[PDB]
Write a protein that holds these residues in place. Structure first.
Motif: not given
Lengths: 58, 58, 56, 56
Positions: B1, B3-4, B6-8, B10-11, B22, B26-27
């Motif tokens: 899991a 991707s959740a 990685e997104l968390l 970033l957020l 960072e 991410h980009f």
């Protein structure tokens, strides 16, 4: 000066609302993986979600 | 899991602080392009910045 | 040599930015940044990287 | 045919979610979602995509 504009689009969306399509495009992920990420963080209480709405074309 | 998570990451950083490293990761951008993006948005008043600090190793 | 820089950093325990170092010694900014980065690469210093955050 | 769905959507001018459509007709959620997506792909409907935002 694309990159400042791409980053600004992401940062604006984090606050105003982002779509799985937008997340997929920024991260270079497949759509299903972006959707899963977002759905899991919504479940976890990190995000709020406005569900998709369909209406008549004019 | 991944991707959740990685997104968390970033957020969380958008709010608490993100580095050019960072953002590059991410980009999928080169470091100089991430740095430029961040520096331009800092100039534009979108972001605040805490400059790098160097201290003695123990 | 970086004898002066290390002595200065010995006091200031929270660390210093390149700008603070340049101001203290009256060094050009590029000189301050290169000296700190050199000492970081050598393992003499630790570095907290610049962080950018959204305005609330 | 989607005669009932289009009539319903004719009233509700701001549009409806798949869940609201499923509840109204007593259709399974999958059936509601597939019918709306079909009509969107056909150009009969417009769709505002789900958006997620940070909690303040």
């Amino acid at each position: 000066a694309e990159s400042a504009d791409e980053l600004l689009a992401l940062l604006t969306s984090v606050r105003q609302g982002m779509t799985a399509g937008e997340v997929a495009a920024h991260f270079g992920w497949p759509l299903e993986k972006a959707r899963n990420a977002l759905e899991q963080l919504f479940s976890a209480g990190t995000l709020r979600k406005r569900s998709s709405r369909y209406r008549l074309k004019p």
